[PDB]
Structure formats: C-alpha cells, structure tokens
Paper text:
The facultative intracellular pathogen Listeria monocytogenes, like many related Firmicutes, uses the nucleotide second messenger cyclic di-AMP (c-di-AMP) to adapt to changes in nutrient availability, osmotic stress, and the presence of cell wall-acting antibiotics. cbpB encodes a 150-amino-acid protein that is conserved in some Firmicutes. We determined the structures of free CbpB and CbpB in complex with c-di-AMP at 1.6- and 2.4-Å resolution, respectively. These structures reveal that CbpB has tandem CBS domains (CBS1 and CBS2) that interact to form a disk-like head-to-head homodimer. However, here we found that CbpB is a direct activator of RelA and that c-di-AMP inhibits CbpB-dependent RelA activation.
The structure of free CbpB is similar to the c-di-AMP complex, with root mean square (RMS) distance of 0.86 Å between their equivalent Cα atoms. The major differences between the two structures are within the c-di-AMP binding site. Notably, the conformation of the Tyr45 side chain in free CbpB has severe clashes with the bound position of c-di-AMP, and therefore the binding site does not exist in free CbpB. While these structural differences exist, they do not provide obvious explanations for how CbpB-RelA interactions might be regulated. The CbpB structure exhibits very little change upon c-di-AMP binding and appears as a homodimer in both the free and nucleotide-bound forms, similar to the crystal structure of the CbpB homolog from B. subtilis, DarB (PDB1YAV). It remains unclear how such modest structural changes result in such large impacts on protein-protein interactions, and future work should compare these structural characteristics with those of a CbpB-RelA complex. The third category maps to the conserved surface of CbpB, which is far away from the c-di-AMP binding site and could be involved in another function. Although this analysis is not conclusive, it suggests that this region could be important for the interaction with RelA.
Numbering used by the authors:
A (entry chain A): 12 to 73, 75 to 149
B (entry chain B): 15 to 142
Amino acid sequence: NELADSMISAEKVAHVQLGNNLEHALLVLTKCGYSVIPVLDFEFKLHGLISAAMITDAILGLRIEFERLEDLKVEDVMQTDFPVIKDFNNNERIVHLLVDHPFVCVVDSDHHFEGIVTRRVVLKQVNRYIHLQVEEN
Amino acid sequence: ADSMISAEKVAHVQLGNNLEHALLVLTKCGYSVIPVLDFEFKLHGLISAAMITDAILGLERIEFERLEDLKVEDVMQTDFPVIKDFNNNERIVHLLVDHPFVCVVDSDHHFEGIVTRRVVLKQVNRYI
Ligand SMILES: [Cl-]
C-alpha cells in the first residue's frame, strides 16, 4: 500500500474555485508551495489545474497587463486536459502517469478531489532499492 | 549521466535583470524554476514566479509596479545543491528524493545543465 499511503491528502493541497479571479489565484499559488494547483467547484469536484505561467501568459500584451488579473476567471486559463487516479489497484498505470506528470490528482468516482500522488514516493523506492543492492553486495 | 538536460536547452536570466524580465522569461520558457547566470555563464541562483511574487506581496495588494525596481539577485534562491559530475550516482538519486531537479556545474561554477526526476521514472516504467 505504499503508493496509496503516500497520497497527500486534499486538505494539505491548496486549491482555487471556479469563478475566482486570477489575482486571487496568483496569491494562493504564491503562498502554497505548489507550482500547479487544482481548480475545484463548490462541490469540491476537480475541474482543472492552474499555474502562474498559465495566468501570466493570459495577460501578456503587445506590456504584461497585470490590471486584467482582476477581471479574468481561473476557468478561463486553467488546463482542462489532465490525468486522474481513481484507485490504487494498478501500480504500473500510476508510475506511467508520473513519467510526464510531476503529480497526479486522486478523485473518487464522482470526481470529488481526494489528494495528489507525486514522483517523490517513486524516488524514495528507487533510493531504497539502490541501498538494498549495496547491502546485498 | 546521459539524461542531463544541457544548459543551452534551459532558459536563464542574468544578474541585474529586473523581475519583470524574469517573469516574461519564466512564462514563455516552460520551466517553473530557471537559473540566474553571469557573463561567464556561472550559476549564481535559481528564480521562480513564486519567489518573484512573494517579494511584491504587500499588506493590502500585490504591488506589481515594484517588479521593475527589484533585480533577480534580490529574490533568487542561493542555497541549492549541485553536482559536478556523475562520479557519485548514489548521491544524485538521494538528492532527487527531496529535489525535483539538481543543477550540474563545473569546479568554476559554470552552468552545465540539470538532472531531473523524470529519467528515473522512465527507468521504473520500463522495468515495470
Ligand atoms: Cl518532480
């Protein structure tokens, strides 16, 4: 159960809500310690992922138009194309997703946001394996 | 060893550049953290949008007008691990447990590239 036990619980992951403006999202991103955060609805279902780069790209003028952050909404710029994990029954699919994704969101069958799995657990396992090889030799 | 992303494929900023320029480079480049170099391409620090925005967080507002007043060296992180070569492979994997990437430099602090967690994930996927 090592992949499942490594999930970071949702209440430890900052998020924004549909309808939040981009100035609010930038504040959450800056304080939270994650470079990408989930976008949830009022039922805590997962709709998207947002980063500072997505926000700033949206206000790149012909001048960075920081005044526009007040008016744009997170759903206007968030990424809607993302993988999810719905169970821990398949270790290989999770490891496969972590190749091109630094973390993957965990949701239940109705898309309620549960937490994230990151690459760190796999690095911990590789680290342990390397040390076991030293021990065995 | 063969997985290092070489320095010329990584965007950087230079000492003395302001935070407005750094935000532009960060936004376009596709890396969330980029190196800060000097004229000799020596590594002085690492900078991210979160470091930049934290520096201009007021008690009432995000003070974007201050981006042109601050320089990258004012906000960059200067305490980070590096590797000089691939003569200590166990240390590299050890570092990648708590760091998403580590910079590669030479003895003169010249920036050579970065090693990331992705290559390890690639190997694990292939073994599995
Ligand atoms: Cl990572």
